[PDB]
Unconditional design. Structure first.
Lengths: 101, 98, 91, 65
RNA sequence: UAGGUAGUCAAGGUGCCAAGAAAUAGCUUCUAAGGUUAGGCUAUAAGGGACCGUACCGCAAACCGACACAGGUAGGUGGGA
RNA sequence: UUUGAUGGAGGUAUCAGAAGUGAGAAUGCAGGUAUGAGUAACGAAAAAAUGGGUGAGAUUCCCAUUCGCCGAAAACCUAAGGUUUCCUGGGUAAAGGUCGUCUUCCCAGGGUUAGUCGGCCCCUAAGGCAAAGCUGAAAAGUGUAGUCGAUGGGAAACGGGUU
RNA sequence: CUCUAGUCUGUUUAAAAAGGCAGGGAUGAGCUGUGAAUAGGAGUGAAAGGCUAAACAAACUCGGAGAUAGCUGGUUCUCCC
RNA sequence: GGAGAAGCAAACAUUUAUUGAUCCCAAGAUUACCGAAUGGAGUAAUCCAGCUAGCAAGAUGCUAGCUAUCUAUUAUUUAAAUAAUAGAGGCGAUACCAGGGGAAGUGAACCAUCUAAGUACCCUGAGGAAAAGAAAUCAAAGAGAUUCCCUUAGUAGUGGCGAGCGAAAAGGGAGUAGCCCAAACUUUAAAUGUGUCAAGCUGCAGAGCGUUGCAUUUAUGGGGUUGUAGGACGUUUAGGCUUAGUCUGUAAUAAGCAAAAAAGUUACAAAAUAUUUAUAUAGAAGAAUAAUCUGGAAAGUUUAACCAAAGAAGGUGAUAGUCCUGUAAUUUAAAUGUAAAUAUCUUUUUAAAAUGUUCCUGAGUAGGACGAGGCACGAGAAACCUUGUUUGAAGCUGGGGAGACCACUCUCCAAGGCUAAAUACUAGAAAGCUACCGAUAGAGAAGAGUACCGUGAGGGAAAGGUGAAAAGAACCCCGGGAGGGGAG
C-alpha cells in the first residue's frame, strides 16, 4: 500500500541475512508490500524457461525483501522519513536531521 | 448496427480452406444478432462485392467441467456460443484480405 | 360483495353459541355455554331501482334495508352526498 | 489513450470510421495468425469508446465546441 | 417376357346402425363505406426468401430404471427357401 | 511433577470469580480402520481361435483369415429424450466389475449451410385466460364478446456426387 | 400387439415385483401414441378399505413444533460420615 | 492521489502510464433481452404487428419513437366514448405497525365449558415508525391530549368457582403542542325548481316593481369552533380615505390600501439561492532506537535512551510505543446528498374590551328489543363501548357518564377532520466492544444453498494450514511412467 520510498533510492537493510548492506531499490511489489534491493537477498534459482529440450540452467537473482526491513540511507546516515510542504511541493526529509533527500 | 459490428473475423480451418479453394466460399464469424440480409449488405460494403447467397448457423456453447484448486468436479462451465456464416460469391469474384 | 354500495356495510363474522340450562333470572341454577362454532351475519342487500326524474331514468343500486330506510328519511341526493358518493358512479 | 481532446465533431466522425477500419483489419490479421501487438486490439477498442462518448456529448451539448 | 405381393385406384363400391370434428385457415364467390391503374386478371423479364432446429445415439455402454442393469422403448422399410 | 526423544511457538504460579467445567454404552452422531475374507460374486448355456502389425509392456488394441449368433433383427431410416457423447490427434490419476496401447475416459482442435424437410405463420378440437355483466370477508369464484391453445387442417423437389 | 391362471428359477436377486416355461384376449366392454380435464376429510374407483409420482383406513412439502407421553433408553471426576 | 497499472492469485509475452495512468468519490453518458413488463400474444430472456422518420425500402429487411390498465381531477350529456395531466401496479425487511380471517398439538392427568389465543398462519394497507392522539374522559381524587416505563399487583374481579385468566385509577418518569372544518349569517354566481307582488336595503326622502322573486344543489370569499360559545340584534367604537350597505345626496356600516404577526412537523400552499470549518459521500499531515549475545531469521537476552492528547489494534523471518501501515488531538469538499438559521418568498390579523332577545351547534344519530364480539370481567345483579337484524329521540328550559336501576349531586358536551416528540423494528451501512467461536466449533456456507436427491413444491452436504521467502528439486542413476535413490 502507501509508502514513502521511491524506486532508485539507496537503502540500508535493517534485518535479514544482509545486515546493513546498502543497495539501490530496483523494484517495488506493492501488492505484496515487498521490495527488491539490487544485489541483496541473493538466491540461486533453476529455470528451464520452456518445455522443449535444448537446456536449462541455474541463475542467480534477488528475492523480494519486505518493505519494513529497509530504511533510506543518504549521505552516511539512515533514518525515518517525514514530509514537508514548501514551494507548493510535497517533499521528503530525514526525521533524524531534516535535509533535502 | 453498422456493417462493422456484423462481421467479426474470418475462419482459417482445413474445411474452410478446401471449400474456398474449390467452390469459392468464404466463412466468417459474425455477430449473433445478424441475419442473412445485413450479412450480405455488410459483405458488400466491406469488400465491394455482392454475394449470391449467405447461409447462417448457430454454434452452441461447448460445456466444460470445472474442478477445484485440488481438482474435482464442482460445476459446469461453458464457452460462448456464436454464429457462423457461409458466403457464396460469383466465380469471378474474390476477397483479397485473406 | 355483500357490500352496501352506499355505506359500506359488509358481513360480520362471529360465533354460534348454544346454551344449556335455565337463567338465574328465571329461577334456574344458571346457563352453560356449549361448543361455539364459527358463523357469519349477512347484510340483506336489496337490488333496488330508484327512478330519478332529474334525468328521467331508473338507476339500480345494491343497498341494505337500513340504507333504504335512511334514504326514505333524508333523500337520495343528500344521502349520497353525506357518504361522498355520486349518482354517476352508478349506471 | 490517444489525444483527440481538441478535435471537432466531423473530424471525430472521420476518426471513428478509420479506426473502425483499423479494428476490423486488426481482427482479420490476428485470425490469419501473427500479430505482434495483440493488445493493440484493446487500445483501439478503448479509442472507439472514447470517440462514442465524445460525439454523444456533442449532441447532448454537455461539451460545447 | 411370365407370375405377382403393398400399396394405390379407394374419403371407391356394396350393406349395416352405434348415424360417424371444427375453422374467423386455405380455395371459390359476393356485395357496403370507399375506388374507376386505385386496383385486379391473363403473361413475360428481372430478384425477394423470413427466423429457429439441422452433429450423433435413438431396441441401447448415449432415452427412462441410483448401474456400461436379463426392464420399459413411437412410427415407416420386413430379403431368400 | 523430573529426566529424554519428538516438536518449533506461546503458556502460566498464588488468590478470587464465572461455566458449553470431566463419557464406557442412549439399536447415539461424525470420521478412520478391523472382522467375516482374499471368501461370495465378477451380471444371462449367441463361441471363440490362429497369424501379423502398433507399442516399454498384447488371450482382451488394430488388421487379416476361419468359426459362431441375430436375421417381422440383435438390421437400416425418422420421433420421443439426451446435448458434444460426433470427427481428427495426443494421453492413461481415477473411473470401465479384470488387463489394456483401447473406450460413450480425459485434454486440444474441428464439425450441424434450407424458398421446397420439421417448426415459426394463417386456422380451429379438448382446454386455458378473458374487458363487460353477475356472484363472493379479502385473496377470488362463474362467465359473454374475444384471444390463445396440435397429436389435426393449409403454397412449393427429386436423383446423383463430394468431406 | 396387449394381459398373468398354474409351475419353476430368483428372493444379502440381473429386476424395491422380473425371467424361464405356458395360458387368456386377439374386429372389440380392443390395444396404443400424442395433448387436455378431475387434488387431500377431496378426487377417482366394471368396487379389492384400491389407486392418486416405488410407501395411502385420509398424499406430499413447509410452518405451528423442541406437540404431548403415568412408556422405554441415556445421564460423564474423587473421597469421608 | 502521485508511481505504477492491465479485476478477484500469479504465470506467457504485449502494451499503456510523469501529456498524470490505475484506483477512490461525486455527477453525467452508454445502458442488449427477459422480468410489475404495459402494442397484441407467449413455453420468461421471442415470435406477430398498427403508425411515423431514415436505410435504393421492396419482395414477412434493419434502426429510432408511440398505442396496457385502474383511480382521482375535467375537455364534452365524468354512465358510453376518446382527450388532458396527476397518483398507483411490483419488489424489498424469513423485521416492526394497522385492518380483515382465524385454527390445531396442550393443560384441565378424560373431555364438551374454559385454557392455549387473537398464537401460528393467510389476506388487504401504507409508513419510517405505524396505530392512536387534544375528554359528551378518568373517577370520588382534583386533576386535565395521546403513547411508552417503574410501581400499584398477582391486587380488584372473573372462571364445569375446576384448571386458569387477569386489570384500572392514583403516584413516580421518559417525552411534549395544540389545532383546523361543517352548521349558525353573508358575498360572488351558475345549475335545477318555483314565482308576477310590496321581493330585495343600515334606517327618513325620491327613484323601484321583479338589484333572479324566494328556496335547494355546485363553486368562491368573509364569518366563526365552546364547563354555550359563535352570529343577527345593544353602544364606545370602527387608523384614515376611496368604493356601496337594491340607485343618487346625509347620521350609519362593509369591500380594498398604511401598520404587524406567523408559515411547508399539524396548524395555507409552491419554491429558490446566498449563507453554517455543520454533516453524509473521496483525502492530507501525524511524534519517538542504538549497541551487544544466542540463532537461519530479534522485535527477544542484556546495557542505555527517546516519544506520548499517540503503550488501540495488525503486519514486519522468534515476542515492536519509537520498522511499515495506522492510532490520539486535529483536519480535504470542486461536485452531490441531508440538516437547521437568516432574509427573500408565501399567507393571515389590517379591531377589541363589552348585556339581553332570536338562529344554529353535527339525525336513522343517542337510546330501546333480539342475536354476537371486544373490555380483566364465560348472563352473572352485568354497567359501558363497538356492532348485525328491527325500532326510534331530544334541540341547553338539553344530553351523556358516575359497573343493574331510581332520585339528588358532581363532572363532561358526542354523532367533522389533522397532529411532531417519547415508543416498535435492523434486513442492512459505517465506526467499536466481548470471562463470544477457532474448522465435528463458528452463519447451512473460511469454498455455497454449490455438489447431490425428488416430476415439482422442497430438502441438503463434506473439503482451512509447505516454507520466513517456490528460492517448485538444475543435472545424474533405476523405471514406459509414477516413484525412489544422489546431487542442490
Amino acid at each position: 500500500m502507501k509508502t514513502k520510498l521511491k524506486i532508485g533510492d539507496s537503502v540500508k537493510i535493517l534485518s535479514g541475512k544482509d545486515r546493513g548492506r546498502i543497495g539501490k531499490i530496483a523494484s517495488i511489489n506493492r501488492k505484496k508490500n515487498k521490495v527488491i534491493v539490487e544485489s541483496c537477498n541473493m538466491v540461486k534459482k533453476v529455470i528451464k524457461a520452456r518445455t522443449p529440450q535444448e537446456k536449462g540452467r541455474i541463475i542467480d537473482k534477488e528475492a523480494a525483501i519486505d518493505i519494513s526491513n529497509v530504511m533510506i540511507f543518504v549521505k552516511g546516515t539512515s533514518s525515518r522519513l517525514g514530509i514537508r510542504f514548501e514551494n507548493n511541493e510535497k517533499i521528503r526529509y530525514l526525521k533524524k536531521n531534516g535535509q533535502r533527500i | 448496427m453498422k456493417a462493422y459490428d456484423i462481421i467479426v473475423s474470418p475462419m482459417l480451418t482445413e474445411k474452410t480452406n478446401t471449400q474456398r479453394e474449390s467452390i469459392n466460399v468464404y466463412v466468417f464469424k459474425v455477430n449473433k444478432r445478424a441475419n442473412k440480409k445485413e450479412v450480405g449488405a455488410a459483405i458488400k460494403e466491406l469488400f465491394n462485392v455482392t454475394p449470391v447467397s449467405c447461409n447462417l448457423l448457430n454454434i452452441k456453447s461447448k460445456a466444460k467441467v470445472v474442478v477445484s484448486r485440488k481438482g474435482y468436479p464442482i460445476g459446469k462451465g461453458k464457452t460462448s456460443s456464436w454464429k457462423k456464416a457461409y458466403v457464396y460469391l460469383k466465380k469471378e469474384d474474390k476477397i483479397d484480405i485473406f | 360483495a355483500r357490500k352496501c354500495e352506499i355505506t359500506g356495510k359488509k358481513t360480520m363474522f362471529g360465533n354460534n353459541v348454544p346454551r344449556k340450562g335455565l337463567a338465574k333470572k328465571k329461577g334456574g341454577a344458571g346457563q352453560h355455554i356449549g361448543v361455539k362454532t364459527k358463523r357469519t351475519f349477512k347484510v340483506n342487500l336489496i337490488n333496488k331501482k330508484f327512478f330519478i326524474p332529474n334525468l328521467g331514468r331508473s338507476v339500480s343500486i345494491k343497498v341494505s334495508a337500513n340504507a333504504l330506510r335512511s334514504i326514505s328519511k333524508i333523500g337520495l341526493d343528500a344521502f349520497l352526498k353525506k357518504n361522498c358518493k355520486k349518482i354517476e358512479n352508478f349506471l | 489513450m490517444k489525444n483527440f481532446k481538441n478535435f471537432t465533431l466531423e473530424d471525430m466522425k472521420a476518426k471513428r470510421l478509420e479506426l473502425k477500419k483499423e479494428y476490423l483489419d486488426l481482427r482479420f490479421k490476428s485470425v490469419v495468425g501473427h500479430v505482434e501487438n495483440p493488445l493493440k486490439k484493446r487500445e483501439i477498442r478503448r479509442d472507439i469508446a472514447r470517440l462514442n462518448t465524445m460525439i454523444c456529448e456533442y449532441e447532448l451539448g454537455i461539451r460545447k465546441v
